[PDB]
Design a protein around this nucleic acid. Sequence first.
DNA 1: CGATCACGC
DNA 2: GGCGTGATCG
Length: 580
Amino acid sequence: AKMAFTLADRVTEEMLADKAALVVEVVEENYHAAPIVGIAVVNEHGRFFLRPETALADPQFVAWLGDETKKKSMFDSKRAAVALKWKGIELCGVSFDLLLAAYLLDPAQGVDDVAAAAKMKQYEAVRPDEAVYGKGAKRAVPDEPVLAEHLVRKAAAIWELERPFLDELRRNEQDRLLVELEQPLSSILAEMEFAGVKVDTKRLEQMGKELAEQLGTVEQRIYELAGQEFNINSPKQLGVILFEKLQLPVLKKTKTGYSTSADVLEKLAPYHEIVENILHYRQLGKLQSTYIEGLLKVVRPDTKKVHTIFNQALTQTGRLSSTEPNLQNIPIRLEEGRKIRQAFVPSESDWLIFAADYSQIELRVLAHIAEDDNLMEAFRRDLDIHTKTAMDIFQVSEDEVTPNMRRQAKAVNFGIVSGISDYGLAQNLNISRKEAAEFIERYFESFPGVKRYMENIVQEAKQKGYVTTLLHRRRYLPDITSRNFNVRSFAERMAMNTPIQGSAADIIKKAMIDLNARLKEERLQAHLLLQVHDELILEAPKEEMERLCRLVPEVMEQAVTLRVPLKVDYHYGSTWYDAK
DNA sequence: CGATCACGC
DNA sequence: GGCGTGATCG
Ligand SMILES: Cc1cn([C@H]2C[C@H](O)[C@@H](COP(=O)(O)OP(=O)(O)OP(=O)(O)O)O2)c(=O)[nH]c1=O
Ligand SMILES: OC[C@H]1O[C@@](CO)(O[C@H]2O[C@H](CO)[C@@H](O)[C@H](O)[C@H]2O)[C@@H](O)[C@@H]1O
Ligand SMILES: [Mg+2]
């Protein structure tokens, strides 16, 4: 069965043809500054394996990699591009990324290696990466003969699969989504990840010191009030202390026992002194374990930067995710956690952090897609949509919607369109099921086009087998025709939500591409650091801030044209905290 | 490795 | 209600 190839000792001219499938293998999951273990090239002239020490120290190979006119087809080009950047080598000319192609054709497939993508087209002449490298503790690069055969088979699969994938993308009207949106975005994400974000490590260490002390204090107080020691970090052990020893009322249950969630503890606070201590301990512990220790573990000691990886081929709706570290979930809502953001600083002296965010983008997207006259008029008047909803469902004037009311209208605005029930909304708003049913009815009376959207998009999903977003991303929903009610219900909620969340994802991706082009045209030093779903974070010289204040919102506001305006709020400052 | 919890959008 | 990461338990 073996596949024929040349195990080359030196780079030859026929390896540098103007179209090739290229594999630049990085086996460590986190590819930042990781080793490249081998290279395979498949082109019109044959199949080749190259040792990295050789190829990457060859001026002609290096020049070929960087020549935009020499076209390469790859799988996970970002991984290769970033690992090359760490070696001071530029990769250009990537015209097809099989990972991004498979992701667009069906995100549910969970494609995370060439073999899985190949399976989508009945191509099985390549092994899964896990079969070759093993997993976890057993993980390891095999001897050269086995490694080279594997890389060549992956390159040969990419070579064969480009056309069928591109054909199906075209049938799906996703060809531009790949070539004009996702692939250009991949390069931008590569730059952002490689740039990293600088952190004030001394500040983090200091916070960590103060957290460890307070943690020790609250822990003893807790054991003192409980009349005993227990593992506070065990919801089960906690439940026993709270509901069996101290006999606090059981306000909520989970599947396997008593709930001890923050919301429940908040309701129990009045009942006993131990409760406030538990919340405090949990708050401190989250900051310490997840954020302080997590960030300090991954900061690069030479530059003080952290380098996330944006997974561009994971979420079912077309969002990015962020890992190791996750820079999309740094605290902000509560001041204590928000202080962590003080430790995220500009990479150079006399630079500043600039943050821009798409105010209520999901509801603006809903207004556009549903063509609800009331929702559209509200955004055209630049009303605060949560206050306007508060006004409609509670039947009050603007002047009398309290902050608590706005927070509630938020819950209604987030929940209804995404398929919340009367039961769940009642839980959310701490009112009766019947009370919540009345608000939902009033909501649909106020926003009838939204009701019509929910009905129509579910009907369409049932008819076509999938739902789509503004720029033609798709999500298949086979469960929407399940004879099982609960299973089907989940699918109906996905049908209503995906087009909204996914269109918002399309828009910000396009804005990132538009933004980078404008920044380059203007020769600004400003560059992107992070995306957090509906916001973009940049750093730049202080001397560029006035230009950015006009440029960034304009670019983001103009990324797409909807039936209502896109609104962008922006702030800058000396740290991410201050960009508020 | 599923549950629970807590953080973001 | 939707989409994520990850700490921690058992
Ligand atoms: C906080 C929160 C956000 N989200 C999603 C939907 C939100 O529109 C999006 C952004 O969060 P928010 O910025 O809090 O929502 P918003 O922009 O609509 O309202 P506000 O003017 O008060 O900022 O995150 C939820 O789905 N559930 C939630 O509880
Ligand atoms: O390089 C990211 C890219 O690779 C995949 C697997 O093909 O994910 C791998 O890398 C991630 C980033 O380090 C890890 O979180 C993940 O566990 C690992 O499998 C794709 O999922 C991703 O798009
Ligand atoms: Mg907002």
